[PDB]
Design a protein around this ligand. Structure first.
Ligand code: ATP
Ligand code: ATP
Lengths: 573, 588
């Protein structure tokens, strides 16, 4: 049960508030027992000598004894649950942040193991099952323990045997039942958690791609498998309900046995006298009422077969090391940046063949180069290595005659801007979907930069307060590319990485975009990865096939002269 | 959420108990039997105690009632077990049925209505909102009659001994409903607001998780934490707000029950002493009546507290039923769901006059299109970006709502029995994604029983087997989350192979040569031309080279078509087409 230890240590910040709960619990349990015990004893003892000889003075037992037990029984309970709950959620939310932080600094190959449909389950629905741990696990046990000892010690003053019998029966039940009801709950909770995660993942995967499923008629199979994986979850829930019902029945039977034993045994005298009188009533009533405190003890321990699984999942999620690591206080931004790649060798994880070997290049003080290649040749892998996603397994990647590693996250992520070939539309306001580049900016530069790229149709009607992405307006296939280009010019930066502009645009729009890009980027350095051989007047042309530079021409002229590669690339094959 | 909305939601929730009233009746009967048994036990215990205390009679003469008390206890335990099991089963059945209905409607909806909310919101609505009605459907409904029935029997059994205690209980009884109806509405509204906040949080988290690459490359590692913190605070506040009302109601009920118990005990204690002597049937008061009343009163009050506890579960169910009821009353694309089959084979012909394709909100994405594709042939759409070509393809597929046009073979497209209609299409899509797990399953998504034509399909579209002897396993490679195992240009060929496996009668080709080099695009184009020559096609190609023998060219922009001609007659002075071709040829 060591999986529950780290999450049980979150008491150093809310110790007093949670301890007040257990104090109030023992107080209200004591009041609840005392009310019935005193009422029974008064009703029994007012009838023996109450007919004549009114010497049992009246105005102490009902007034002080009972009216003081009808308030504490209620006011004790209401303040007990109102405080503790307030603490518990105040912890849970904190966890919901902490895990999220540990999920941030691993985008590539880090979260590629876990399916993205169940990480949401771990974050949301697997942190809401610890409220049982923070509410029911601790307080009932100590409350029942203290109440049982207090009652037994109080009753031991008269006829040790009876009080010892009652206390022993209560202690035996308390120490026996939870260890016996933990067992089946273990397996049932494990199945519950696993099946809930699987069902959520499958349901999420069923959507986000309904179009292809429904066009090709492949939805009935997935629906059938969804129902199949839900049936077992329902069955396990039924098993849990059955176990709970059996627990309640056993509690009732134990209470009946205790009541019967205490009633029958207290006949020959509860302490001498061979005929007690008015004491059997209190002894019966105390046993009758004492088990309402012990009733909820087993429901707290039975449900520990589900909390452990969630704790294990969260612990696994929060204990993964990163793969990059950053230095400190090395920002020192500049205006002119060069680039040097002496040797680069990379092998993707879990793979066995190098996807990028033997690459060397040098870009000097704001050049303009474009690289060409086959459909698959590791050209987008080269770009993603310059933003420190993975770590090269050989060679060096210099930057302005300085190692890339000796640069903190506030600098490498500042003088680098990228335009990836897979754009994402965040479900947020257009003003918030475009302020990622430059958070400060203004509300006027946004319109100006949105008008030159050529959109001119989004800042209308509602305008910059419209809701884009899912749940709102969805952009087309070219507007997405234009928006990706637009949120790469506000960021500025002296080094731009255009992964693949103009993929899904017509001739006129692409021409306008090319003219704009050429005009605005003049003092910077551009590394283009293009498939259209359109307007190649750059200062360096580079071609790749599998790993290395086939020809580093850099003039666009001798390729038309030397009948090598790129000579057949544009004529046709 | 006004009073009328709550009434409508309550009626809708009550509608679904028809298939479980059969077990609700059994639950009510079992509760009634338990209520009888507990009274019997109380009477037995009271008689035993009076005989034991007053007359000092030895145990042996009271050997009879002990066995009856034991039997009553055993019977009570058995009854409670059976009642709990029956209640749970009756609760589960209705949730199963409701989830089946919701999934059916969601499948019938389509891909345009699904994007109305993020997938996280859909998952939360399907799981939590459906699962949170179990308490209402299992506990509250049987208890609504038990809380009326059992106290009446208890007070009736108490009556024939001393009317004062019964009068006290009857006077104390009516106060509870007046004090739960004062917080019911607040609970019912707070529940809905809390559920809305939870759905918002889940959707935000899922959407942020999907696009982590942009956040990393742009360095936004601080604002997202702030947004998550705000969402968590908004969730926590509503949760505390509903729990506070629940606690207050429970405390008030407990206080009143305790006060009534104290009053009854005080009266019975004072009566024996000869101080009050007002309530009796002129025969005094005995210990048996007092003990019986003392034992029975808390059990008289318990069902009312149970009803007060289950009222908040009912409020939770009412609040949860607000989000999934509105969605179940929103019109779909075509609100008829027609029924007709357009035979088989019989080469198609798409003809439309004045077709205005709308949006799932009410906007307009097209204009007065007038066209007719005669008995096969091939059609290409070329024009300025942002005109509505993909909207036309979606309307032809059947994911949007049109207005009075687009009939095929003389039959309107509105009543073609969608399940039968979608069998004649071989979609290719723009920016495709792989929804399966293994690379072999995606290429076999149409006809999953074939092992020889798979190789021919993978070799005809070509260049999908060129990278096959490079993956770790082979044709059974477990592709990544979206497409992480493959690149961008290697998924287009997979989609093309998927679209070319089996014959069809209508081929809606989106842009097939996306992110491809010259050789690969040329081979895929040759394969697609060979496949397309055999039946009706519709292409939205974006390059103005090699279209000399495509039979028809439709230049379209601003959501309408101006020029519908041929390559020879449109390459001389054909307005916008000439300008586009000139730009394309001069830029090279
Ligand atoms: N996440 C990944 N894990 C392992 N291998 C990968 C991953 N992503 C891509 N690859 C491998 O990288 C190789 C191609 O590299 P990359 O994806 O950079 O291609 P590319 O030439 O940039 O393609 P494109 O021009 O279409 O962008 C292939 O062998 C592919 O399987
Ligand atoms: N549901 C919608 N709500 C609002 N606007 C929409 C919706 N769907 C499409 N649009 C808008 O319709 C316009 C053009 O329609 P559509 O999206 O079909 O463009 P398109 O012709 O397919 O463009 P392209 O093929 O060049 O990417 C765009 O401005 C797009 O944002």
């Amino acid at each position: 049960m060591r999986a529950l230890l780290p999450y049980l240590a979150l008491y150093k910040r809310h110790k007093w508030m949670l301890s007040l709960g257990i104090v109030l619990a023992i107080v209200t349990l004591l009041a609840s027992i005392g009310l019935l015990t005193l009422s029974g004893w008064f009703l029994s003892a007012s009838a023996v000598a109450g007919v004549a000889g009114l010497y049992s003075f009246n105005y102490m037992l009902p007034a002080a004894g009972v009216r003081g037990a009808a308030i504490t029984r209620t006011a004790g309970r209401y303040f007990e649950r109102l405080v503790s709950h307030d603490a518990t959620f105040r912890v849970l939310q904190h966890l919901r942040i902490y895990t999220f932080s540990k999920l941030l600094p691993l985008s590539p190959a880090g979260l590629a193991r876990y399916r993205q449909g169940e990480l949401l389950n771990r974050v949301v629905a697997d942190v809401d099952t610890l409220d049982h741990l923070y509410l029911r696990v601790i307080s009932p046990l100590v409350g029942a323990f203290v109440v049982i000892m207090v009652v037994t010690i109080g009753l031991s003053f008269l006829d040790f045997t009876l009080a010892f019998t009652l206390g022993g029966i209560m202690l035996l039940t308390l120490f026996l039942m939870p260890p016996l009801f933990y067992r089946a709950g273990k397996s049932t909770g494990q199945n519950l958690t696993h099946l809930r995660g699987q069902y959520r993942q499958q349901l999420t995967a069923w959507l986000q791609g309904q179009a292809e499923l429904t066009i090709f008629g492949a939805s009935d199979r997935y629906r059938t498998q969804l129902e199949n994986t839900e049936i077992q979850w329902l069955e396990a829930q039924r098993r849990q309900s059955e176990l709970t019902a059996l627990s309640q029945a056993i509690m009732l039977l134990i209470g009946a046995l205790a009541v019967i034993l205490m009633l029958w045994m207290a006949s020959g005298g509860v302490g001498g006298n061979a005929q007690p009188g008015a004491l059997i009533a209190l002894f019966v009533f105390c046993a009758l009422a004492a088990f309402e405190a012990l009733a909820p003890v087993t429901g707290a321990f039975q449900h520990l077969g589900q909390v452990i699984a969630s704790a294990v999942r969260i612990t696994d999620l929060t204990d993964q090391k990163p793969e990059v690591t950053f230095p400190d206080t090395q920002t020192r931004v500049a205006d002119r940046v060069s680039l040097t790649l002496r040797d680069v060798q990379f092998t993707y994880p879990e793979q066995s063949q190098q996807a990028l070997k033997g690459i060397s290049l040098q870009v000097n003080a704001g050049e303009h180069i474009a690289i060409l290649g086959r459909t698959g040749c590791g050209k987008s892998t080269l770009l993603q290595l310059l933003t420190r996603a993975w770590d090269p397994q050989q060679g060096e990647i210099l930057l302005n005659d300085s190692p890339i590693a000796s640069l903190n996250e506030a600098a490498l992520r500042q003088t680098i801007s990228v335009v990836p070939q897979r754009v994402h539309l965040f479900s947020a306001t257009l003003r918030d979907n475009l302020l990622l580049a430059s958070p400060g900016s203004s509300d006027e530069a946004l319109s100006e930069i949105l008008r030159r790229v050529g959109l001119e149709k989004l800042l209308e009607d509602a305008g910059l307060n419209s809701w884009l992405g899912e749940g709102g307006r969805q952009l087309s296939g070219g507007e997405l590319r234009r928006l990706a280009i637009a949120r790469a010019l506000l960021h500025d930066a002296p080094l731009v990485l255009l992964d693949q502009p103009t993929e899904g645009l017509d001739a006129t729009t692409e021409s306008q975009i090319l003219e704009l890009l050429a005009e605005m980027m003049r003092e910077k350095t551009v590394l283009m990865v293009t498939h259209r051989l359109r307007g190649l007047s750059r200062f360096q042309q580079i071609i790749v096939m599998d790993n290395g530079q086939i020809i580093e021409q850099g003039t666009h002229a001798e390729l038309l002269a030397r009948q090598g590669r790129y000579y057949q690339f544009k004529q046709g094959l | 959420m006004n009073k009328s909305r709550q009434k409508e939601l309550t009626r809708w929730l009550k509608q679904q108990s028809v298939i479980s009233q059969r077990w609700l009746n059994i639950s009510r009967l079992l509760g009634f039997v338990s209520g009888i048994l507990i009274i019997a036990q109380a009477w037995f215990m009271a008689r035993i105690l009076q005989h034991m205390i007053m007359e000092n009679i030895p145990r042996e003469a009271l050997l009879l009632p002990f066995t009856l008390l034991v039997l009553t206890f055993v019977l009570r335990a058995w009854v409670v077990w059976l009642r709990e099991r029956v209640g749970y089963h009756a609760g589960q059945h209705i949730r199963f049925a409701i989830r089946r209905q919701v999934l059916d409607r969601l499948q019938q909806a389509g891909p345009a209505w699904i994007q109305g909310k993020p997938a996280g919101s859909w998952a939360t609505l399907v799981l939590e909102q459906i699962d949170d009605m179990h308490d209402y459907y299992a506990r509250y409904l049987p208890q609504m009659a038990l809380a009326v029935s059992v106290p009446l029997l208890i007070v009736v059994a108490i009556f024939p001994s001393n009317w004062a205690a019964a009068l006290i209980l009857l006077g104390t009884a009516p106060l509870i409903p007046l004090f739960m109806a004062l917080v019911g509405m607040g609970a019912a509204d707070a529940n809905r607001r809390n559920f809305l906040a939870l759905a918002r949080l889940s959707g935000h988290f899922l959407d942020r998780l999907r696009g982590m690459e942009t956040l990393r490359i742009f360095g936004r590692g601080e604002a997202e934490i702030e947004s998550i913190r705000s969402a968590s605070e908004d969730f926590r506040q509503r949760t505390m707000e509903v729990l506070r009302l629940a606690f207050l109601s429970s405390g008030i009920l407990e206080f009143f029950t305790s006060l009534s118990i104290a009053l009854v005990a005080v009266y019975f204690g004072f009566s024996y002493l000869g101080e009050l002597d007002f309530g009796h049937y002129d025969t005094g008061v005995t210990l048996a009546a007092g003990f019986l009343a003392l034992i029975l009163a808390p059990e008289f009050f318990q069902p009312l507290r149970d009803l007060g506890t289950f009222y908040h579960a009912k409020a939770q169910a009412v609040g949860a039923a607000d989000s999934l009821k509105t969605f179940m009353e929103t019109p779909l694309a075509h609100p008829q769901r027609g029924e007709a089959e357009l035979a088989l084979t019989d080469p198609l012909t798409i003809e439309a006059e004045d077709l205005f394709i709308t949006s799932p909100e009410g906007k307009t994405l097209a204009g007065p299109l007038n066209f007719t594709l005669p008995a096969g042939q091939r059609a290409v759409l070329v024009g300025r970006s942002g005109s509505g070509k993909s909207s036309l393809l979606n309307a032809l597929s059947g994911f949007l709502s049109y207005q009075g046009s687009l009939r095929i073979n003389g039959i309107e497209l509105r009543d073609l029995s969608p399940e039968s209609w979608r069998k004649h299409l071989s979609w290719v899509g723009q920016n495709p994604q792989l929804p399966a797990a293994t690379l072999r399953d995606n290429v076999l998504l149409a006809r999953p029983d074939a092992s020889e034509q798979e190789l021919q399909a993978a070799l005809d579209n070509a260049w999908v087997s060129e990278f096959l002897p490079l993956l770790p396993q082979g044709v059974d490679t477990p592709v990544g989350d979206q497409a992480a195992r493959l690149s961008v240009g290697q998924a287009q060929r997979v989609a093309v192979a998927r679209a070319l496996l089996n014959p069809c009668s209508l081929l809606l080709l989106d842009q097939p040569a996306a992110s491809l080099d010259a050789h690969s695009e040329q081979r895929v184009m040759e394969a697609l031309n060979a496949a397309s020559l055999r039946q009706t096609t519709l292409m939205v190609t974006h390059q103005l080279e090699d279209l000399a023998d495509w039979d028809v060219i439709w230049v379209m922009q601003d959501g309408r078509i101006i020029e519908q001609g041929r390559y020879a007659e449109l390459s001389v002075a054909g307005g916008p087409f000439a300008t586009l071709l000139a730009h394309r040829q001069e830029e090279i």
